[PDB]
Amino acid sequence: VSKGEELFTGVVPILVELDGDVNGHKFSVRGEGEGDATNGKLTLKFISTTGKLPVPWPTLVTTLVQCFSRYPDHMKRHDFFKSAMPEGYVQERTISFKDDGTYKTRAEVKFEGDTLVNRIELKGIDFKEDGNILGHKLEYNFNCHNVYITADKQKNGIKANFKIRHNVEDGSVQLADHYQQNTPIGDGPVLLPDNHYLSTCSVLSKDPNEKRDHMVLLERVTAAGITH
C-alpha cells in the first residue's frame, strides 16, 4: 500500500545515536541491532560512551523506531511510519514524569543505505535529585503499553499519546506521560491513519561481556484497533 513498506520485507539493520542532557548531566548513547516488521520484533544493544548514565535506562526506552511495528494486512493502509520511508520522519516528544521532571526529544528516523537510523537529541529539566529518575530507583524492566495514534492532517503526519508505567524498586509505580508528534521528511503523500494503537511489550537484559553501562532490549510491537 506504500512504496516505503517494501523496505521492511526483511530484517533491517538499525543504528541509534542519542545525545542527552538531564539537569545539566550530559550523556551519549549509541546502539545497534535489527528490526523485523514482518514479525513486529526488534533486538538492540545500547551502550553509554560517557560513563554511568545519570538516568535509568528504562526512562530512555521509548526515545531510543515505530516503523518496525507489525501492521496486520487489514490495517496496512494506516501505517504512516513506513509510508514516510526512505526519507523518514521527525519524531518529537515531551515526556512528563509524574511528580518529577520532563524530557523533550527530537529525532530524525530515516534510511541511510540499508540501515534504519534513529538520531536523537534529548533535554531533561526540573528533575528532583532525590526522585526516582536521578536517584536511580527504577527497576530494570519494562511493561507492555498501548500507543494511541491519531492523524494530524495539518502537519501531514500523526500524533500519539500514551502513559508509560515504570516499576519503582519500593513497589510503587512512576508514570511517564508521553506526548508525541511525527512529521514526514519527504514531500510525497503519506498514509494518514484512522485512530488505532500499537500494542508494545519490551524485555530488558544485560550483556555479560559488556563493561560499559548498557542495555540489551527485545521489543514486540503490533498495530491494532481497526477490525478486518
From Swiss-Prot:
InterPro entries documented for this protein: GFP (IPR009017), GFP-related (IPR011584), Green_fluorescent_prot (IPR000786)
What does the UniProt entry list as the effect of changing residue 66 to M? Answer: In Citrinine; leads to excitation and emission peaks of 516 and 529 nm, respectively
**Domain of life the protein comes from:** Eukaryota
Known consequence of changing residue 172 to G? In GFPA; leads to enhanced fluorescence at 37 degrees Celsius. In Venus; leads to yellow fluorescence, improved maturation and reduced environmental sensitivity
Changing residue 125 to V has the effect of: In EBFP2.0; shifts the excitation and emission spectra to shorter wavelengths and increases quantum yields compared to BFP
Q: How is it used?
A: Green fluorescent protein has been engineered to produce a vast number of variously colored mutants, fusion proteins, and biosensors. Further generation of mutants led to more stable proteins (at 37 degrees Celsius for example) with brighter fluorescence and longer fluorescence lifetimes.
Q: Name one GO biological process term.
A: generation of precursor metabolites and energy
- In UniProt terms, what is the effect of altering residue 147 to I? In Azurite; shifts the excitation and emission spectra to shorter wavelengths and increases quantum yields compared to BFP
Q: How is expression of this protein distributed across tissues? A: Photocytes.
Q: What is the effect of changing residue 46 to L?
A: In mut3.3; shifts fluorescence lifetime from 3.03 to 1.88 ns. In R10-3; matures to the red-emitting state with excitation and emission maxima at 555 and 585 nm, respectively
Q: How is it modified after translation?
A: Contains a chromophore consisting of modified amino acid residues. Maturation of the chromophore requires nothing other than molecular oxygen.
User: One Pfam family of this protein, by short name?
Assistant: GFP
Impact of mutating residue 164 to V? In P9; increases fluorescence at 475 nm excitation. In R10-3; matures to the red-emitting state with excitation and emission maxima at 555 and 585 nm, respectively
> Quick one: effect of changing residue 173 to A?
In mut2.1; shifts fluorescence lifetime from 3.03 to 2.50 ns
Q: What's the reported outcome of changing residue 65 to N?
A: In R10-3; matures to the red-emitting state with excitation and emission maxima at 555 and 585 nm, respectively
Cite the effect that the entry attributes to residue 190 to A: In mut1.5; shifts fluorescence lifetime from 3.03 to 2.72 ns
Q: What is the effect of changing residue 219 to G?
A: Suppresses the 399 nm excitation peak, leaving only the longer wavelength peak at 475 nm
Kindly give the Gene3D superfamilies that the UniProt entry links to this protein: Green fluorescent protein (2.40.155.10)
Which UniProt key words apply to this protein?
Answer: Chromophore, Luminescence, Photoprotein
Q: What is the effect of changing residue 69 to A?
A: Increases fluorescence at warmer temperatures such as 37 degrees Celsius. In GFPmut 3; highly fluorescent mutant when excited at 488 nm
Q: Which family does it belong to?
A: Belongs to the GFP family.
Role description? Energy-transfer acceptor. Its role is to transduce the blue chemiluminescence of the protein aequorin into green fluorescent light by energy transfer. Fluoresces in vivo upon receiving energy from the Ca(2+)-activated photoprotein aequorin.
Assembly information from the UniProt record: Monomer.
State what protein this is by name.
Answer: Green fluorescent protein
Name the gene for this chain: GFP
